[PDB]
Amino acid sequence: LVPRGSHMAKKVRFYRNGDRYFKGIVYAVSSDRFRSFDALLADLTRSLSDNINLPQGVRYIYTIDGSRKIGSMDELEEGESYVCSSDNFFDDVEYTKNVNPNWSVNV
């Protein structure tokens, strides 16, 4: 087992800034799966970038409403959605429209 973290994978959904027709990619995030926050950013750059999206790669992770930036894997919350950005501009588009909402825990 890796000697860092909790070992419990966090299921999170990643969107790419300004793209209204992007599904989001569901990641199982843990220290066993990603060496560091940087390895997660590198992985996200490869999965989310294209010739029209994230030209400088994934360098910022915002909360779904763009209120706050995430700076560690610890800051990510299970069942939450995040927006990946190449810069400091959060694009207010309908990311969450026409997506399956995650299972909300009742008990």
PDB file of all heavy atoms in Angstrom, residues 49-79:
ATOM      1  N   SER A  49      -7.799  17.849 -22.498  1.00  0.00           N
ATOM      2  CA  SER A  49      -7.251  18.711 -23.550  1.00  0.00           C
ATOM      3  C   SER A  49      -7.500  18.165 -24.930  1.00  0.00           C
ATOM      4  O   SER A  49      -7.588  16.946 -25.156  1.00  0.00           O
ATOM      5  CB  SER A  49      -5.744  18.895 -23.397  1.00  0.00           C
ATOM      6  OG  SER A  49      -5.420  19.677 -22.263  1.00  0.00           O
ATOM      7  N   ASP A  50      -7.583  19.095 -25.858  1.00  0.00           N
ATOM      8  CA  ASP A  50      -7.675  18.889 -27.301  1.00  0.00           C
ATOM      9  C   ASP A  50      -7.192  20.165 -27.980  1.00  0.00           C
ATOM     10  O   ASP A  50      -6.672  21.055 -27.307  1.00  0.00           O
ATOM     11  CB  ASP A  50      -9.061  18.372 -27.785  1.00  0.00           C
ATOM     12  CG  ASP A  50     -10.288  19.180 -27.465  1.00  0.00           C
ATOM     13  OD1 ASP A  50     -10.167  20.408 -27.295  1.00  0.00           O
ATOM     14  OD2 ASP A  50     -11.388  18.617 -27.532  1.00  0.00           O
ATOM     15  N   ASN A  51      -7.333  20.263 -29.283  1.00  0.00           N
ATOM     16  CA  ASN A  51      -6.858  21.459 -29.950  1.00  0.00           C
ATOM     17  C   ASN A  51      -7.647  22.747 -29.699  1.00  0.00           C
ATOM     18  O   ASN A  51      -7.159  23.822 -30.003  1.00  0.00           O
ATOM     19  CB  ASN A  51      -6.447  21.213 -31.411  1.00  0.00           C
ATOM     20  CG  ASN A  51      -7.237  20.252 -32.215  1.00  0.00           C
ATOM     21  OD1 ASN A  51      -8.470  20.242 -32.176  1.00  0.00           O
ATOM     22  ND2 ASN A  51      -6.534  19.528 -33.079  1.00  0.00           N
ATOM     23  N   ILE A  52      -8.816  22.647 -29.075  1.00  0.00           N
ATOM     24  CA  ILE A  52      -9.646  23.804 -28.782  1.00  0.00           C
ATOM     25  C   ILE A  52      -9.893  23.950 -27.285  1.00  0.00           C
ATOM     26  O   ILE A  52     -10.423  24.967 -26.835  1.00  0.00           O
ATOM     27  CB  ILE A  52     -10.922  23.775 -29.683  1.00  0.00           C
ATOM     28  CG1 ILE A  52     -10.605  24.151 -31.156  1.00  0.00           C
ATOM     29  CG2 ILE A  52     -12.114  24.559 -29.127  1.00  0.00           C
ATOM     30  CD1 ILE A  52      -9.893  25.537 -31.444  1.00  0.00           C
ATOM     31  N   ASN A  53      -9.465  22.963 -26.501  1.00  0.00           N
ATOM     32  CA  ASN A  53      -9.681  22.995 -25.067  1.00  0.00           C
ATOM     33  C   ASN A  53      -8.399  22.873 -24.301  1.00  0.00           C
ATOM     34  O   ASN A  53      -7.528  22.088 -24.679  1.00  0.00           O
ATOM     35  CB  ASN A  53     -10.657  21.909 -24.651  1.00  0.00           C
ATOM     36  CG  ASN A  53     -12.051  22.114 -25.189  1.00  0.00           C
ATOM     37  OD1 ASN A  53     -12.888  22.772 -24.571  1.00  0.00           O
ATOM     38  ND2 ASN A  53     -12.335  21.535 -26.345  1.00  0.00           N
ATOM     39  N   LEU A  54      -8.299  23.665 -23.214  1.00  0.00           N
ATOM     40  CA  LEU A  54      -7.195  23.757 -22.261  1.00  0.00           C
ATOM     41  C   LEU A  54      -5.822  23.811 -22.962  1.00  0.00           C
ATOM     42  O   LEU A  54      -5.086  22.813 -22.948  1.00  0.00           O
ATOM     43  CB  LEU A  54      -7.320  22.620 -21.224  1.00  0.00           C
ATOM     44  CG  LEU A  54      -8.712  22.464 -20.623  1.00  0.00           C
ATOM     45  CD1 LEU A  54      -8.870  21.159 -19.997  1.00  0.00           C
ATOM     46  CD2 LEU A  54      -9.030  23.558 -19.661  1.00  0.00           C
ATOM     47  N   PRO A  55      -5.514  24.927 -23.690  1.00  0.00           N
ATOM     48  CA  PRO A  55      -4.252  24.964 -24.474  1.00  0.00           C
ATOM     49  C   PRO A  55      -2.976  24.808 -23.639  1.00  0.00           C
ATOM     50  O   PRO A  55      -2.049  24.123 -24.071  1.00  0.00           O
ATOM     51  CB  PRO A  55      -4.334  26.299 -25.219  1.00  0.00           C
ATOM     52  CG  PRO A  55      -5.290  27.128 -24.398  1.00  0.00           C
ATOM     53  CD  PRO A  55      -6.283  26.184 -23.834  1.00  0.00           C
ATOM     54  N   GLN A  56      -2.983  25.348 -22.398  1.00  0.00           N
ATOM     55  CA  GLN A  56      -1.884  25.298 -21.429  1.00  0.00           C
ATOM     56  C   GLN A  56      -2.037  24.108 -20.420  1.00  0.00           C
ATOM     57  O   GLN A  56      -1.295  23.978 -19.440  1.00  0.00           O
ATOM     58  CB  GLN A  56      -1.770  26.641 -20.701  1.00  0.00           C
ATOM     59  CG  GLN A  56      -1.165  27.749 -21.560  1.00  0.00           C
ATOM     60  CD  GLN A  56      -0.900  28.987 -20.734  1.00  0.00           C
ATOM     61  OE1 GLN A  56       0.172  29.143 -20.135  1.00  0.00           O
ATOM     62  NE2 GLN A  56      -1.891  29.871 -20.634  1.00  0.00           N
ATOM     63  N   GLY A  57      -2.984  23.243 -20.724  1.00  0.00           N
ATOM     64  CA  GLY A  57      -3.319  22.083 -19.925  1.00  0.00           C
ATOM     65  C   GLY A  57      -4.198  22.440 -18.753  1.00  0.00           C
ATOM     66  O   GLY A  57      -4.686  23.562 -18.629  1.00  0.00           O
ATOM     67  N   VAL A  58      -4.365  21.492 -17.851  1.00  0.00           N
ATOM     68  CA  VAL A  58      -5.146  21.731 -16.633  1.00  0.00           C
ATOM     69  C   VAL A  58      -4.208  22.275 -15.577  1.00  0.00           C
ATOM     70  O   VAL A  58      -3.299  21.558 -15.151  1.00  0.00           O
ATOM     71  CB  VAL A  58      -5.919  20.474 -16.158  1.00  0.00           C
ATOM     72  CG1 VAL A  58      -6.587  20.727 -14.811  1.00  0.00           C
ATOM     73  CG2 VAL A  58      -6.926  20.022 -17.204  1.00  0.00           C
ATOM     74  N   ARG A  59      -4.389  23.546 -15.189  1.00  0.00           N
ATOM     75  CA  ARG A  59      -3.550  24.234 -14.193  1.00  0.00           C
ATOM     76  C   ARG A  59      -4.355  24.749 -13.006  1.00  0.00           C
ATOM     77  O   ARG A  59      -3.763  25.137 -11.987  1.00  0.00           O
ATOM     78  CB  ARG A  59      -2.765  25.392 -14.836  1.00  0.00           C
ATOM     79  CG  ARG A  59      -2.085  25.038 -16.174  1.00  0.00           C
ATOM     80  CD  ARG A  59      -1.088  26.069 -16.629  1.00  0.00           C
ATOM     81  NE  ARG A  59      -1.691  27.390 -16.801  1.00  0.00           N
ATOM     82  CZ  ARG A  59      -0.994  28.515 -16.860  1.00  0.00           C
ATOM     83  NH1 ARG A  59       0.329  28.487 -16.782  1.00  0.00           N
ATOM     84  NH2 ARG A  59      -1.615  29.678 -17.001  1.00  0.00           N
ATOM     85  N   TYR A  60      -5.706  24.803 -13.150  1.00  0.00           N
ATOM     86  CA  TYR A  60      -6.637  25.213 -12.087  1.00  0.00           C
ATOM     87  C   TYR A  60      -7.840  24.317 -12.024  1.00  0.00           C
ATOM     88  O   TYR A  60      -8.348  23.887 -13.058  1.00  0.00           O
ATOM     89  CB  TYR A  60      -7.102  26.683 -12.228  1.00  0.00           C
ATOM     90  CG  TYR A  60      -5.950  27.655 -12.374  1.00  0.00           C
ATOM     91  CD1 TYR A  60      -5.507  28.047 -13.628  1.00  0.00           C
ATOM     92  CD2 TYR A  60      -5.234  28.094 -11.264  1.00  0.00           C
ATOM     93  CE1 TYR A  60      -4.375  28.844 -13.783  1.00  0.00           C
ATOM     94  CE2 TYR A  60      -4.134  28.941 -11.402  1.00  0.00           C
ATOM     95  CZ  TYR A  60      -3.715  29.320 -12.668  1.00  0.00           C
ATOM     96  OH  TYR A  60      -2.621  30.123 -12.852  1.00  0.00           O
ATOM     97  N   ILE A  61      -8.295  24.016 -10.805  1.00  0.00           N
ATOM     98  CA  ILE A  61      -9.505  23.234 -10.590  1.00  0.00           C
ATOM     99  C   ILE A  61     -10.422  24.093  -9.750  1.00  0.00           C
ATOM    100  O   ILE A  61     -10.043  24.474  -8.647  1.00  0.00           O
ATOM    101  CB  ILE A  61      -9.229  21.824  -9.975  1.00  0.00           C
ATOM    102  CG1 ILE A  61      -8.382  20.927 -10.922  1.00  0.00           C
ATOM    103  CG2 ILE A  61     -10.541  21.133  -9.513  1.00  0.00           C
ATOM    104  CD1 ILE A  61      -7.899  19.627 -10.307  1.00  0.00           C
ATOM    105  N   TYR A  62     -11.610  24.440 -10.280  1.00  0.00           N
ATOM    106  CA  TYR A  62     -12.614  25.237  -9.557  1.00  0.00           C
ATOM    107  C   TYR A  62     -13.731  24.361  -9.048  1.00  0.00           C
ATOM    108  O   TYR A  62     -13.970  23.290  -9.601  1.00  0.00           O
ATOM    109  CB  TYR A  62     -13.274  26.254 -10.506  1.00  0.00           C
ATOM    110  CG  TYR A  62     -12.417  27.433 -10.862  1.00  0.00           C
ATOM    111  CD1 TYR A  62     -11.561  27.390 -11.959  1.00  0.00           C
ATOM    112  CD2 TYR A  62     -12.507  28.622 -10.147  1.00  0.00           C
ATOM    113  CE1 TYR A  62     -10.774  28.488 -12.305  1.00  0.00           C
ATOM    114  CE2 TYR A  62     -11.737  29.732 -10.489  1.00  0.00           C
ATOM    115  CZ  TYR A  62     -10.871  29.658 -11.570  1.00  0.00           C
ATOM    116  OH  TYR A  62     -10.100  30.735 -11.899  1.00  0.00           O
ATOM    117  N   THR A  63     -14.500  24.876  -8.072  1.00  0.00           N
ATOM    118  CA  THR A  63     -15.720  24.215  -7.624  1.00  0.00           C
ATOM    119  C   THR A  63     -16.740  24.488  -8.757  1.00  0.00           C
ATOM    120  O   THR A  63     -16.527  25.419  -9.551  1.00  0.00           O
ATOM    121  CB  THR A  63     -16.173  24.716  -6.243  1.00  0.00           C
ATOM    122  OG1 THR A  63     -16.255  26.136  -6.249  1.00  0.00           O
ATOM    123  CG2 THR A  63     -15.253  24.230  -5.111  1.00  0.00           C
ATOM    124  N   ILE A  64     -17.810  23.675  -8.853  1.00  0.00           N
ATOM    125  CA  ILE A  64     -18.806  23.787  -9.927  1.00  0.00           C
ATOM    126  C   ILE A  64     -19.397  25.184 -10.197  1.00  0.00           C
ATOM    127  O   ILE A  64     -19.787  25.459 -11.337  1.00  0.00           O
ATOM    128  CB  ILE A  64     -19.860  22.655  -9.850  1.00  0.00           C
ATOM    129  CG1 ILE A  64     -20.503  22.343 -11.228  1.00  0.00           C
ATOM    130  CG2 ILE A  64     -20.883  22.900  -8.740  1.00  0.00           C
ATOM    131  CD1 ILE A  64     -19.578  21.802 -12.294  1.00  0.00           C
ATOM    132  N   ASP A  65     -19.437  26.064  -9.158  1.00  0.00           N
ATOM    133  CA  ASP A  65     -19.952  27.442  -9.259  1.00  0.00           C
ATOM    134  C   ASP A  65     -18.833  28.486  -9.417  1.00  0.00           C
ATOM    135  O   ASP A  65     -19.113  29.679  -9.462  1.00  0.00           O
ATOM    136  CB  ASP A  65     -20.858  27.767  -8.055  1.00  0.00           C
ATOM    137  CG  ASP A  65     -20.156  27.873  -6.719  1.00  0.00           C
ATOM    138  OD1 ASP A  65     -19.125  27.188  -6.531  1.00  0.00           O
ATOM    139  OD2 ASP A  65     -20.670  28.601  -5.837  1.00  0.00           O
ATOM    140  N   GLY A  66     -17.583  28.021  -9.473  1.00  0.00           N
ATOM    141  CA  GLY A  66     -16.381  28.837  -9.620  1.00  0.00           C
ATOM    142  C   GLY A  66     -16.053  29.703  -8.425  1.00  0.00           C
ATOM    143  O   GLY A  66     -15.231  30.613  -8.535  1.00  0.00           O
ATOM    144  N   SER A  67     -16.684  29.427  -7.280  1.00  0.00           N
ATOM    145  CA  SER A  67     -16.509  30.181  -6.038  1.00  0.00           C
ATOM    146  C   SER A  67     -15.115  30.022  -5.430  1.00  0.00           C
ATOM    147  O   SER A  67     -14.602  30.965  -4.827  1.00  0.00           O
ATOM    148  CB  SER A  67     -17.563  29.772  -5.015  1.00  0.00           C
ATOM    149  OG  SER A  67     -17.374  28.431  -4.583  1.00  0.00           O
ATOM    150  N   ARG A  68     -14.522  28.820  -5.556  1.00  0.00           N
ATOM    151  CA  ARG A  68     -13.224  28.499  -4.956  1.00  0.00           C
ATOM    152  C   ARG A  68     -12.375  27.604  -5.868  1.00  0.00           C
ATOM    153  O   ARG A  68     -12.929  26.862  -6.689  1.00  0.00           O
ATOM    154  CB  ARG A  68     -13.473  27.760  -3.630  1.00  0.00           C
ATOM    155  CG  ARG A  68     -12.310  27.870  -2.656  1.00  0.00           C
ATOM    156  CD  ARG A  68     -12.444  26.892  -1.523  1.00  0.00           C
ATOM    157  NE  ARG A  68     -11.321  25.956  -1.494  1.00  0.00           N
ATOM    158  CZ  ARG A  68     -11.384  24.733  -0.977  1.00  0.00           C
ATOM    159  NH1 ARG A  68     -12.516  24.281  -0.454  1.00  0.00           N
ATOM    160  NH2 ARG A  68     -10.322  23.949  -0.994  1.00  0.00           N
ATOM    161  N   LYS A  69     -11.030  27.667  -5.685  1.00  0.00           N
ATOM    162  CA  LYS A  69     -10.046  26.837  -6.359  1.00  0.00           C
ATOM    163  C   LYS A  69      -9.548  25.728  -5.415  1.00  0.00           C
ATOM    164  O   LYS A  69      -9.405  25.941  -4.209  1.00  0.00           O
ATOM    165  CB  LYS A  69      -8.879  27.674  -6.871  1.00  0.00           C
ATOM    166  CG  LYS A  69      -9.132  28.355  -8.209  1.00  0.00           C
ATOM    167  CD  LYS A  69      -7.844  28.983  -8.721  1.00  0.00           C
ATOM    168  CE  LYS A  69      -8.089  30.376  -9.230  1.00  0.00           C
ATOM    169  NZ  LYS A  69      -7.034  31.319  -8.769  1.00  0.00           N
ATOM    170  N   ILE A  70      -9.322  24.543  -5.965  1.00  0.00           N
ATOM    171  CA  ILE A  70      -8.851  23.346  -5.251  1.00  0.00           C
ATOM    172  C   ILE A  70      -7.339  23.250  -5.415  1.00  0.00           C
ATOM    173  O   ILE A  70      -6.836  23.381  -6.516  1.00  0.00           O
ATOM    174  CB  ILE A  70      -9.620  22.075  -5.774  1.00  0.00           C
ATOM    175  CG1 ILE A  70     -11.178  22.220  -5.656  1.00  0.00           C
ATOM    176  CG2 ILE A  70      -9.092  20.752  -5.227  1.00  0.00           C
ATOM    177  CD1 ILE A  70     -11.743  22.537  -4.321  1.00  0.00           C
ATOM    178  N   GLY A  71      -6.632  23.047  -4.313  1.00  0.00           N
ATOM    179  CA  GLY A  71      -5.176  22.984  -4.314  1.00  0.00           C
ATOM    180  C   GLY A  71      -4.542  21.690  -3.843  1.00  0.00           C
ATOM    181  O   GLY A  71      -3.310  21.598  -3.744  1.00  0.00           O
ATOM    182  N   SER A  72      -5.367  20.695  -3.524  1.00  0.00           N
ATOM    183  CA  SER A  72      -4.897  19.384  -3.070  1.00  0.00           C
ATOM    184  C   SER A  72      -5.974  18.345  -3.318  1.00  0.00           C
ATOM    185  O   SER A  72      -7.140  18.711  -3.480  1.00  0.00           O
ATOM    186  CB  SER A  72      -4.541  19.418  -1.584  1.00  0.00           C
ATOM    187  OG  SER A  72      -5.672  19.621  -0.750  1.00  0.00           O
ATOM    188  N   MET A  73      -5.599  17.047  -3.335  1.00  0.00           N
ATOM    189  CA  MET A  73      -6.546  15.945  -3.481  1.00  0.00           C
ATOM    190  C   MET A  73      -7.458  15.874  -2.237  1.00  0.00           C
ATOM    191  O   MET A  73      -8.615  15.481  -2.348  1.00  0.00           O
ATOM    192  CB  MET A  73      -5.813  14.616  -3.687  1.00  0.00           C
ATOM    193  CG  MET A  73      -5.130  14.514  -5.022  1.00  0.00           C
ATOM    194  SD  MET A  73      -4.614  12.822  -5.379  1.00  0.00           S
ATOM    195  CE  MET A  73      -3.173  12.639  -4.276  1.00  0.00           C
ATOM    196  N   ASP A  74      -6.943  16.303  -1.070  1.00  0.00           N
ATOM    197  CA  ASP A  74      -7.660  16.346   0.191  1.00  0.00           C
ATOM    198  C   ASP A  74      -8.870  17.294   0.129  1.00  0.00           C
ATOM    199  O   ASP A  74      -9.889  17.009   0.745  1.00  0.00           O
ATOM    200  CB  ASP A  74      -6.680  16.687   1.338  1.00  0.00           C
ATOM    201  CG  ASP A  74      -7.339  17.223   2.593  1.00  0.00           C
ATOM    202  OD1 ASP A  74      -7.917  16.408   3.345  1.00  0.00           O
ATOM    203  OD2 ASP A  74      -7.309  18.485   2.805  1.00  0.00           O
ATOM    204  N   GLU A  75      -8.752  18.398  -0.613  1.00  0.00           N
ATOM    205  CA  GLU A  75      -9.792  19.406  -0.790  1.00  0.00           C
ATOM    206  C   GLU A  75     -10.980  18.915  -1.653  1.00  0.00           C
ATOM    207  O   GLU A  75     -12.067  19.504  -1.581  1.00  0.00           O
ATOM    208  CB  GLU A  75      -9.202  20.672  -1.389  1.00  0.00           C
ATOM    209  CG  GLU A  75      -8.476  21.522  -0.378  1.00  0.00           C
ATOM    210  CD  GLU A  75      -7.513  22.546  -0.933  1.00  0.00           C
ATOM    211  OE1 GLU A  75      -7.917  23.438  -1.713  1.00  0.00           O
ATOM    212  OE2 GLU A  75      -6.347  22.508  -0.479  1.00  0.00           O
ATOM    213  N   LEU A  76     -10.763  17.886  -2.488  1.00  0.00           N
ATOM    214  CA  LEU A  76     -11.819  17.295  -3.298  1.00  0.00           C
ATOM    215  C   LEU A  76     -12.814  16.573  -2.355  1.00  0.00           C
ATOM    216  O   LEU A  76     -12.400  16.000  -1.357  1.00  0.00           O
ATOM    217  CB  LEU A  76     -11.249  16.295  -4.341  1.00  0.00           C
ATOM    218  CG  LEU A  76     -10.296  16.856  -5.393  1.00  0.00           C
ATOM    219  CD1 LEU A  76      -9.544  15.753  -6.066  1.00  0.00           C
ATOM    220  CD2 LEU A  76     -11.018  17.741  -6.434  1.00  0.00           C
ATOM    221  N   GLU A  77     -14.111  16.673  -2.630  1.00  0.00           N
ATOM    222  CA  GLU A  77     -15.137  16.009  -1.832  1.00  0.00           C
ATOM    223  C   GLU A  77     -15.834  14.973  -2.691  1.00  0.00           C
ATOM    224  O   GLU A  77     -16.146  15.249  -3.848  1.00  0.00           O
ATOM    225  CB  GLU A  77     -16.177  17.008  -1.321  1.00  0.00           C
ATOM    226  CG  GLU A  77     -15.698  18.056  -0.322  1.00  0.00           C
ATOM    227  CD  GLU A  77     -16.587  19.292  -0.239  1.00  0.00           C
ATOM    228  OE1 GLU A  77     -17.825  19.137  -0.102  1.00  0.00           O
ATOM    229  OE2 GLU A  77     -16.044  20.419  -0.327  1.00  0.00           O
ATOM    230  N   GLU A  78     -16.075  13.775  -2.130  1.00  0.00           N
ATOM    231  CA  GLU A  78     -16.780  12.654  -2.767  1.00  0.00           C
ATOM    232  C   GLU A  78     -18.159  13.113  -3.295  1.00  0.00           C
ATOM    233  O   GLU A  78     -18.895  13.809  -2.586  1.00  0.00           O
ATOM    234  CB  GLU A  78     -16.932  11.499  -1.748  1.00  0.00           C
ATOM    235  CG  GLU A  78     -17.946  10.414  -2.114  1.00  0.00           C
ATOM    236  CD  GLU A  78     -17.501   9.321  -3.063  1.00  0.00           C
ATOM    237  OE1 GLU A  78     -16.308   8.954  -3.017  1.00  0.00           O
ATOM    238  OE2 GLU A  78     -18.364   8.777  -3.790  1.00  0.00           O
ATOM    239  N   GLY A  79     -18.459  12.748  -4.538  1.00  0.00           N
ATOM    240  CA  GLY A  79     -19.708  13.104  -5.208  1.00  0.00           C
ATOM    241  C   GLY A  79     -19.842  14.532  -5.705  1.00  0.00           C
ATOM    242  O   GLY A  79     -20.924  14.917  -6.146  1.00  0.00           O
TER     243      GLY A  79
END
